[PDB]
Design a protein around this ligand. Structure first.
Ligand SMILES: O=c1[nH]c(=O)c2nn[nH]c2[nH]1
Ligand SMILES: O=c1[nH]c(=O)c2nn[nH]c2[nH]1
Ligand SMILES: O=c1[nH]c(=O)c2nn[nH]c2[nH]1
Ligand SMILES: O=c1[nH]c(=O)c2nn[nH]c2[nH]1
Lengths: 295, 295, 295, 295
């Protein structure tokens, strides 16, 4: 037997950082959960009990806090790139670092219509994420994403004209509820290293905001022919607005809400045009994915 | 042996309802999870296998959907009261109904600065809840609550002057992070029945909004001496603003964020006035409760 | 306004303890999650920002570890009683301690048919719990429980003869699946204090084992007329076998498995006597409770 | 823009099946959660709103139940292969099916030392899983796994001799607790189609049992130099015992249990040789992975 692939590191490292503006008294907080996995010439720790090649996972944890102390933690694309680069530059035998960051929402509170200087609310479970792969000699690959964005529209979704055969019971519909939890990822063109990532810093927050905006607007405005058709429209627009993105991927559950026939009870009408009360279904759910790139 | 207490019913009944304004085209959605438990002269189903006294839990589920079809589902205090009253009026041998409702957020989307007619976002995991106990001959007892409201302030929290003995290692502090998930309940004066609940309908949404507002403002503005002191200020204000509330209860975790001493690393300063990077602690957590009533 | 009730302390305190037999080399591990809440003359911490009455929750955490170091942690009824007693004896102004303990399973591994001296498996998510209320002048009240015991029987459950009216669609059945997650609590007679709890130490593990055994055997062997009828049989037996128990409470979800009619597909028969494939339902679920005491 | 990759289908399909032996009266239950995703010539559903190419996800759900009715559901490697093959044979334009199955434990109860004919216990949250990729013209690729197997050993784990630099605070140790949740995957050699999978049916359960056995025994008996070294020993043995496996992958969290220094309290000794009470850490955790193949 031989080691074909190996990676190790620290997961679930929770980190908070505060910035205090001394002039204005305004404080801004950031909270993230970080995972760093390393690869390199470490096979002997597996095969020979040779711990000399192991940067202890406890040390990786320390490094994350130290790096957060000495560097900006926003945008997460930049922080992840700094963190990953550190390991390949510091340790000769480490040749790749994989950094995953989940950013948690702390939204400044408005109190009596004014932004509060130091109070925050978790206004959603939506996350902004990054995956950064720093590979020696091969640059920096960054995938940015939003996830946990949960939406519903109560009309202007249709689903008809699908394949019908002896396995099919689903009725065609011209008016249904559509609800999903959005997971969208945009993959950046490869960057040559930290200098290039730094040069593009303003684009990261802007592109996240654009991806969010396009997702929400398209969802709300599309008279949807299917999840497939609507998600394609989203991806197309994002690629159009940011030339440094190579691909956009969406992964969308179709969270079903079923009509409830109540006609057995005193002829009560609650289906089709008369449908008012529905049963949200916890499972099963459709799952629809697509990756869209450039011609 | 004898049956001392017994209750049974249906839990986790998910319900969605849509209202469609035909004039304006605006749609409004409500989604809830409902539990109904009944009590009454049902001992024989336990002791004698006498199912004749059992309103099947499946029938309770049907009843919830039928009631939602025929009645407004908002405010939840009203819907729960209608639902509970139904069971004690319909079944001679059922003498109490306990209705718990969790309302899920579907907040109307703003698209290009205008409210969308039929698109919604789950903008938080915060819930609005009710517990309604309808007891034959004893009226309707309603407890309203908000839960899952997660907040953090990065300064203007202190904790000093506590008991110090041989079990104590905690240092006094004049500047710390304070973060919690708010669970607040207000208990209404007993209502004589549905007519009285109906007479107070406008107060329910108003009081929920006030409780939320007071909670957030007090949290943000109090230079907090402790969780205990700050929560008392909240409860006091709520009781002052709504005379039909008898008691207010808060249950608050203290979600700790610890300083990280980095001085071992190149004399790096990250404690006290120099603290920037903190380690959020998943557990353990302080838990502080109080129930405040009228003099 | 006035403080009507107040309690505070530390939740989610994870604790592990190892016992090492030096003669045999056998090691035994215990892992628990502990919550301790205190009550007493502490109103002024809420109303006057008087922290002098507060035993810091951090100190409560320290106390739990210290107590675990100096005392046996099994049975949990004993440990909880020691822990609760500590607070009321140590602090003059603390008059009640509430201790909740969840014991996690670490079952010794059998390797090649022999018990391993120091290796363990979490063989189930089932818990053994205690709630101990130590109230000055009023003794020690202990409720013991098991929870998270998940079972299913594929036949020998019936449900017929229930009330049928215009809300009823459920068909009577003489053969169904029955599945539940068992939550069972037995409440001990009040104990005068620690000496009395110590005097009964052997009964605690024995009664837990008996409660588990009776639950499983009754479930497996009863040709069940309903959840209500079967659970009553369990409670009756437990009360019969341990005279120091005053009440037994069961809380049982009915986790439904629905038949799937496949007759639309090539006349496939999958209902009634021909039912083989079923759809487990995540929600809603029946919820059935009962508390059984002595005549 | 162009569609680079697309797949869609149904997730979270819960399925139960019962087998009833009419001779012996013994019943055996199987419960699984199934996901099926399809790929093929479906781009136009995304780009042109052409639903004619879509096998509705609701139909996929129906197909799963129908297939479970007409075929054995065990071993899951066989069922997944039947299910995947169905879609590529039935639909000309579908060229790949991806089937993921999670098997849930229903272990027969022993009552009074004898196996019960129809009563079952969920004796662990451990799962047995399969991922089956059926690709037209390319055969059937099967990855089998166990997950959620949670173990702890209280001694006979060491960790010393790792890299020490200015980021390192971790002390070397010759005696620590080791605990993990095992996720292990074995990948089968490619099979040419269903006939070949059928020919190997007995190997599937046998190899799962062997993988479990080797994992547990190695964990219990290895005087572990590190997670890396111990996991390599497991993978090596599995590859040795089943020649039709090409690779074995382990992914293991290191679930840390920290010593608690109690010396501040009356000189209490609870570290090193005197360590009895530990603090299990919920996060962060080490994460160690490796994939082992043949020379
Ligand atoms: O077994 C271990 N492997 C590691 O890589 C490691 N790093 N810190 N502690 C550790 N333990
Ligand atoms: O055992 C049962 N008890 C009940 O009360 C019930 N109601 N519907 N099905 C049921 N099954
Ligand atoms: O606000 C607080 N209240 C308390 O009771 C406490 N105990 N430790 N830290 C604390 N903070
Ligand atoms: O939007 C949808 N896409 C699908 O593929 C599908 N299948 N069933 N319902 C559906 N809705």
């Amino acid at each position: 037997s031989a080691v074909k692939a190996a990676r190790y590191g620290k997961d679930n490292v929770r980190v908070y950082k505060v910035h205090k503006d001394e002039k204005t008294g305004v404080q801004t907080v950031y909270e993230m959960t970080v995972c760093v996995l390393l690869e390199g010439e470490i096979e002997t720790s597996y095969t020979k009990a040779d711990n000399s090649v192991i940067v202890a996972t406890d040390s990786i944890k320390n490094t994350i806090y130290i790096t957060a102390k000495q560097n900006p933690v926003t945008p997460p694309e930049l922080f992840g790139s700094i963190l990953g680069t550190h390991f390949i530059e510091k340790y000769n035998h480490i040749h790749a670092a994989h950094v995953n960051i989940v950013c948690h929402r702390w939204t400044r509170m408005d109190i009596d219509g004014k932004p509060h200087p130091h109070s925050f609310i978790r206004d959603s479970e939506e996350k902004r994420n990054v995956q950064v792969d720093v590979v020696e000699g091969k640059g920096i690959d960054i995938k940015s994403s939003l996830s946990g964005l949960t939406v519903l529209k109560s009309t202007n979704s249709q689903f008809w004209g699908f394949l019908r055969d002896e396995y099919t019971t689903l009725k065609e519909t011209w008016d249904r509820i559509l609800s999903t939890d959005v997971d969208a990822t945009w993959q950046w063109k490869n960057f040559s290293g930290l200098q290039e990532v730094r040069s593009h810093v303003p684009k990261f927050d802007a592109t996240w905001a654009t991806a969010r905006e396009v997702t929400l607007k398209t969802f709300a405005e599309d008279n949807s022919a299917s999840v497939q058709a609507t998600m394609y429209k989203m991806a197309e627009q994002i690629l159009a607005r940011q030339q440094l993105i190579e691909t956009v991927e969406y992964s969308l559950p179709n969270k079903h809400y079923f009509e409830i026939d109540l006609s057995w009870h005193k002829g009560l009408q609650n289906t089709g045009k008369n449908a008012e009360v529905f049963a949200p279904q916890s499972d099963p759910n459709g799952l629809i994915k697509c990756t869209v790139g450039r011609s």
